[PDB]
Design a protein around this ligand. Structure first.
Ligand SMILES: Nc1nc2c(ncn2[C@@H]2O[C@H](COP(=O)(O)OP(=O)(O)OP(=O)(O)O)[C@@H](O)[C@H]2O)c(=O)[nH]1
Ligand SMILES: Nc1nc2c(ncn2[C@@H]2O[C@H](COP(=O)(O)OP(=O)(O)OP(=O)(O)O)[C@@H](O)[C@H]2O)c(=O)[nH]1
Lengths: 311, 441, 328, 453
């Protein structure tokens, strides 16, 4: 059965190990579909997304059975909802998941508990990658649209509105990307390396499965992830506010180009809005800083600290 | 996602030859474009799609179009790569050999034959769907090269406003032809301020010095510097040509490196590498990346003001030395109080289909920095231009087309280029101050 | 039926089937064909009654499914559908050749003919409209032909020639209506057993292959006529094959009124041969009325086709989306 | 609905292209230059069908259903000597009238009128040798005066002799003319009959022919024979829909149904990818193209066999036949991309049509880069541009009347006034044709039937 290829495939699928390209392509192809399915209700038809998924699976090589048997489904609960269900924590977005029907005799080793762990980790990585993709799209819209780079009419806005939101996007990038690199190197990379080095001349398949579940537990029992989840639930709402503000300002840029004081009053409304948003982001950052300083276990922690230390 | 390479001038042709050879050796494509990998296993972790087009023959044609006013260098590059590049992706303007090292002749050649290049790039883009931007390889010193580069930059900014356009430009060394070469540069630099979304800087003097340091023979050939540039371009694209989890787009790299479109000129550094033992740990690799004798541009600064730094370490590395070197570098590199002290490291995987480079198991690192050293070379070039312009009116003798019909408009264009590069360097030196972002604080 | 079989043998002689008639290895197969006449009642036309069946004998009848008296008449209904389509196409071709020949005759003997200019314009535009009608007809016909021949070839390459150049896909998957994909049966290893002809089908297997092929044919949505499992077109309330039959009836009425218009034009042509623009004013009025009728039919059919395009776009099937785009 | 078609060779170019086409068909059907099928007559199963173009007297011999007509016996004798026993000597017409007395259309029209009885007898005899007949394929060679006159004579005879047969025509136009006046006059006189009687006409401008023969061939010098080879391969590819009948188009009438929107618009624009059965066809496996790329090349102006003059050209009937192992998904993708990249008249929602052909089991199989080829035919008004300059010539020479002492002999009118009137009438006819073509480029064309009923 060549268990090594199967574990490599499942790491590519549910862990994104050396497979960020495929999931990134799938996210870029259907950003609009995901946002329209997460803003609507469960009665909204998602059959277009299912057709796109099965088309992508058909374009996948038939040998990768783990990807050939990959099936998508929509959940009725959010990811923090099922996290509160399984773990004692307090939380209509991210209702998607993927599952595999492990056959005989592979099902006796690849049980359903590890499958649920894989689904949870995959939905979490999907959340993270979608947020990074939103940040990348925001930076692209900022650095490619001519109105954003254009300046004039005694600006007073570029330095105050554009520069401020650019610095804020830089802060969000230095947070999200930093924590992603930390989790993928000190947790994902180390667990992948251990999973690679353990199957070298194995002794007991039950021992292999026990090591796999222990690594999954170490991934789950990481204090950083548990401390992040509640703060992530607020950082993501801050990101949604930031991107809707970006869209509104992009819509307003073409109109602000030259006569009326009501436009200046709207500009004052926008500047007070974004100053309040920056202050709220700063307060949430300070709260997370307190929470992480109260934590006890520190290299990546020190790097994140340096990132959050104000200049 | 797909990127197209643009080789302008003989310099561009040489560096494109070297880079495509390097990538064919890495991705196991060879000089014949055919897959050097067996057909029994299709599992791959690299991405040859954005740089190579695979046909029914499974041959990888480089996604590059060569533009030059000298057909001999392009013909030679074709001869050394017979069966590798597409003859339809070749553009020589059908005007014969090059003539005139001024920006005027190059820009006029670009304006005259713009339709053919537009058709070529449209055909190349229509070959696929997921396109992201172009790659420009040119020397600002070369007149025809800089003219063609500025023309194509104008065409791609007023034609593809959604495609981010980055370029590679090498500034000349301290020599004699600069008195006119700098001219072209600033003109190109003018467009580099207006339409260029990103730019990696190089200084030919520092490049020659560093090559003479790493190479045993001090008689540094230009092809050796071209090999160095091919290595640095393959290194910066390693995250794109070999993405695993984190970095899969040049847009993300320019996000973490370019904070604002007014500041899109980055200085590279790469160490250690050959062109056979390991004696540079990742900590040593990074402290050498900080060292001025490892940067691909003349520093000429005691303490440059770093704004946003990002590096990629190639090799199997442990995070302990990573954190130690990060702490030491934060203790060493200074950031403005208004900006962030951001430092990011990407673990670049090695290609198993690439022949082993000399000094095996020697971890290496590349770093891209945004500091006030690029503006130092810019100030040197602008001062040379100002001297040779306000002191001698000789540029009114070598012009073509609209620039030859009247030299007063040429003088006005050069003065406007000087003014815009002055505003750019003033914005740079103001960004060094904490009062740069004072409008919000 | 003796003239029928005589015409059959003659058409075999004209077509390449004569080659199969020459080869004794194929003469037995070419003789097994036996056309049939279905009792559809008195008053119908040959274009509606004539059927083309094949009679099989053992040991062949035990494998291939035929239109048996106790079967589902798959081949029968398929041939009837294709026969109505070919009848419409032949009627379009006949109208086209008649119009082309008569307009060629006009151009031959028009000389100057000043008063005819507007009539010639109208005739050209009406022939263009008929061409568009025939284009839509042959377009649907060719889409059906493409899907059918794709099914045939995929069947041959995957059912008749499965043991030769197998798909190599050792994974047997089953799709569930709730999106669940389950591996069928036990998973076999990758051909590794401690070690230190053709997988051909028999009679019942080939017969089940043929029956599943016929089922995959009939289970197509566009072929799902008068079934509760099909979804009707939105804003129409009618199934897609129902609206297709409605459009076929509409275009057949269009062909008939075009035949009437062609007869009127031929009478006007004969009158022009008789006298030089001194009569046929009533024929001109009847031509105008038939033109108005044809314009009304064209507008109604265009509205129906727009509704059909909306149904194909809003059905969800990407192939229906492509078909509606191409018709658009 | 499928019937037999007879080839008509008129003029020196007509005879040369007929020779090349019949050699290409012998190559495809393994018949060779001897008239005896290179395949043994024991294999009765044949996917192709030579009967519509080859009469079978003996089981191994297939006589091409074609008549050789020219005034110069040298080329006819040469083609007969090269093709020993391939052609029928009784179907070779020369009339023994000697060499043509100039390149005047009137000379050819007269030599066709005087010897009309013999050619009509030969045509009737060939019709007697067949049962199911559909129409003829006439090769004009309008660049020559005698050839154009002979073609016009055959057209004027066959329009009223057989009105129930569809008459397609093939007019080859030159790029540059040494005396543009005479060739322009011959082409205008032939185009008059083309508009009057011809049912289908395919134009062949020699400029694109020379360009392609210089591009794909290695030799810079261009020979007329391998240039006619292009037109012969084109005719074979278009006739493939009957010789190798597909499942959508199985009759020339059905093919012209989607190509002839009205008897007025009966001039088509051809295009073809880099060929594979030509002389220098070794530089075709380095292209590495797909079916979508083949469709793009068919829509590219570099592969059109006539003067493109593409200035927002209006299309009326775009059709294509693709020969080889074709994939349906690539076809759908190409159709999607082309419908987004082709100008269509807003009064008609009819889009382009795609047809797929089959490759011969005896043709040399090509590598997977150019194993599949395709032909495209588009109804475009830009064809009148090819005539426009020609009419310009008329419009700038007809004020004086040069070369009038050469079109007065042979024809029924020896006077200058009658010839002048006939030329003015032909000019008026081609002007009205150009007006019809430019009116078809507008939506008011179809609105003419809407404004009145
Ligand atoms: N490092 C390096 N630089 C080169 C090379 N070739 C050209 N250059 C650059 O090009 C400049 C000289 O100009 P040219 O390359 O001749 O460009 P040009 O003046 O437009 O002339 P043409 O390229 O012939 O059109 C030098 O200052 C170099 O910086 C090369 O092979 N290696
Ligand atoms: N491209 C091409 N054109 C030809 C060829 N042969 C003749 N032509 C055309 O025909 C014109 C010359 O007239 P001919 O074809 O010889 O007709 P003709 O002058 O009446 O001579 P005959 O046909 O022998 O009676 C030239 O302008 C060519 O354009 C050929 O082999 N290739």
């Amino acid at each position: 059965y060549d268990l090594i290829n199967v574990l490599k495939h499942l790491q590519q699928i549910f862990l994104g190990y050396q497979s960020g390209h495929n999931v990134l392509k799938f996210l870029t192809k259907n950003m609009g579909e995901l946002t329209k399915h997460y803003r609507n209700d469960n009665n909204a038809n998602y059959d277009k997304l299912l057709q796109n998924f099965e088309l992508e699976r058909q374009s996948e090589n038939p040998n990768n059975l783990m990807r050939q048997l990959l099936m998508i489904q929509f959940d009725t609960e959010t990811l923090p909802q099922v996290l509160s269900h399984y773990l004692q924590i307090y939380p209509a977005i991210y209702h998607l998941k993927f599952d595999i029907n492990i056959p005989y005799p592979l099902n006796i080793i690849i049980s359903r508990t590890c499958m649920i762990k894989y689904q949870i980790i995959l939905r979490y990585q999907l959340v993270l990658q979608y947020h990074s993709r939103l940040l990348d799209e925001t930076w692209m819209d900022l650095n490619k649209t001519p109105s954003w780079k254009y300046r004039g009419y005694s600006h007073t806005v570029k330095r105050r509105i554009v520069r401020a939101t650019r610095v804020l996007h830089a802060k969000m990038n230095h947070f999200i990307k930093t924590i992603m690199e930390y989790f993928n190197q000190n947790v994902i990379d180390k667990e992948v390396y251990s999973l690679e080095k353990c199957y070298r001349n194995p002794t007991l398949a039950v021992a292999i499965q026990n090591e796999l579940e222990g690594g999954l537990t170490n991934i789950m029992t990481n204090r950083c992830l548990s401390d992040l989840i509640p703060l992530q639930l607020q950082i993501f709402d801050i990101v949604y506010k930031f991107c809707k503000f970006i869209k509104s300002m992009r819509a307003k840029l073409c109109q602000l180009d030259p006569q009326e004081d009501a436009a200046l009053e709207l500009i004052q409304k926008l500047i007070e809005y974004i100053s309040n948003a920056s202050s709220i982001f700063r307060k949430c950052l300070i709260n997370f800083t307190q929470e992480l300083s109260t934590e006890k276990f520190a290299a990546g922690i020190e790097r994140v600290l340096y990132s959050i230390v104000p200049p | 996602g797909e990127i197209i390479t643009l080789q302008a001038g003989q310099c561009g042709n040489h560096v494109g030859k070297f880079l495509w050879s390097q990538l064919a050796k890495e991705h196991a494509i060879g000089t014949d474009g055919l897959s050097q990998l067996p057909d029994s296993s299709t599992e791959r972790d690299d991405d040859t799609k954005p740089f190579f087009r695979e046909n029914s023959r499974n041959k990888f044609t480089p996604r590059a179009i060569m533009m030059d006013s000298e057909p001999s260098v392009i013909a030679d590059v074709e001869n050394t790569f017979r069966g590798f590049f597409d003859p339809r992706n070749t553009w020589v303007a059908s005007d014969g050999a090059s003539a005139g090292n001024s920006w005027a002749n190059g820009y006029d050649i670009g304006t005259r034959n713009q339709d053919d290049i537009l058709n070529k790039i449209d055909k190349e883009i229509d070959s696929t769907d997921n396109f992201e931007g172009f790659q420009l390889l040119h020397s600002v010193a070369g007149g025809t090269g800089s003219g063609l580069g500025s023309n194509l930059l104008e065409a791609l900014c007023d034609r593809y406003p959604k495609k981010i356009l980055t370029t590679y430009s090498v500034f000349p060394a301290r020599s004699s032809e600069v008195v006119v070469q700098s001219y072209n540069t600033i003109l190109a630099l003018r467009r580099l301020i207006e339409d260029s979304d990103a730019t990696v800087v190089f200084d030919n003097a520092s490049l020659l010095n560093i090559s003479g340091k790493v190479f045993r023979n001090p008689n540094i050939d230009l092809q050796h510097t071209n090999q160095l540039i091919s290595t640095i371009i393959s290194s910066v694209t390693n995250s794109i040509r070999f993405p695993s989890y984190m970095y899969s787009s040049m847009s993300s790299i320019y996000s973490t490196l370019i904070p604002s479109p007014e500041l899109h000129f980055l200085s590279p550094s790469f160490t250690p590498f050959t062109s056979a033992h390991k004696g540079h740990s990742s900590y040593d690799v990074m402290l050498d990346l900080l060292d001025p004798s490892n940067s691909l541009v003349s520093t000429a600064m005691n303490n440059p003001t770093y704004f946003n730094v990002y590096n990629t370490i190639i090799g199997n590395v442990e995070p302990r030395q990573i954190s130690r070197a990060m702490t030491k570098l934060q203790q060493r590199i200074k950031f403005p109080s208004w900006s962030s002290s951001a430092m990011h490291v990407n673990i670049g995987r090695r290609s198993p289909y690439l022949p082993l480079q000399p000094n095996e198991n020697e971890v290496s690192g590349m770093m891209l920095s945004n500091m006030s050293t690029v503006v130092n070379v810019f100030e040197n070039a602008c001062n040379t231009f100002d001297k040779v312009f306000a002191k001698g009116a000789f540029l009114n003798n070598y012009n073509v087309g609209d620039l030859f019909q009247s030299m007063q408009n040429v003088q006005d264009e050069f003065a406007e280029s000087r003014e815009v590069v002055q505003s750019l360097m003033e914005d740079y030196v103001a960004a060094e101050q904490d009062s740069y972002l004072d409008d919000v604080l | 039926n003796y003239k029928l079989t005589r015409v059959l043998q003659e058409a075999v002689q004209l077509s390449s089937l004569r080659h199969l008639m020459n080869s004794p290895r194929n003469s037995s197969v070419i003789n097994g064909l036996d056309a049939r006449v279905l009792d559809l009642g008195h008053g119908s036309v040959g274009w509606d009654v004539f059927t083309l069946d094949y009679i099989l004998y053992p040991p062949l009848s035990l494998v291939l499914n035929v239109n048996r008296p106790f079967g589902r008449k798959e081949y029968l209904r398929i041939f009837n559908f294709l026969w109505r389509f070919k009848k419409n196409n032949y009627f379009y071709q006949k109208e086209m050749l008649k119009s082309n020949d008569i307009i060629r005759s006009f151009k031959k003997i028009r000389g100057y003919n000043p008063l005819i200019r507007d009539i010639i314009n109208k005739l050209s535009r009406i022939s263009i409209l008929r061409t568009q009608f025939q284009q839509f007809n042959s377009k649907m016909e060719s889409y059906y032909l493409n899907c059918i021949i794709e099914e045939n070839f995929k069947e041959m390459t995957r059912k008749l020639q499965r043991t030769e150049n197998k798909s190599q896909n050792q994974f047997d998957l089953i799709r569930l209506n709730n999106g669940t994909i389950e591996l069928n049966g036990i998973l076999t290893p990758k051909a590794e057993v401690l070690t230190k002809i053709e997988k051909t089908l028999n009679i019942d297997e080939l017969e089940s292959v043929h029956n599943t092929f016929l089922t995959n044919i009939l289970s197509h949505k566009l072929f799902a006529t008068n079934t509760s499992e099909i979804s009707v077109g939105d804003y129409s309330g009618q199934p897609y094959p129902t609206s297709l039959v409605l459009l076929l009836n509409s275009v057949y009425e269009f062909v008939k009124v075009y035949c009437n218009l062609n007869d009127i034009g031929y009478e006007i042509f004969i009158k022009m041969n008789l006298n030089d623009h001194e009569a046929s004013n009533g024929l001109l009025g009847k031509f105008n009325t038939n033109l108005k009728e044809i314009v009304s039919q064209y507008k109604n059919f265009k509205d129906r086709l727009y509704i059909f395009r909306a149904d194909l776009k809003n059905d969800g099937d990407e192939e229906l989306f492509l078909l509606s785009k191409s018709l658009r």
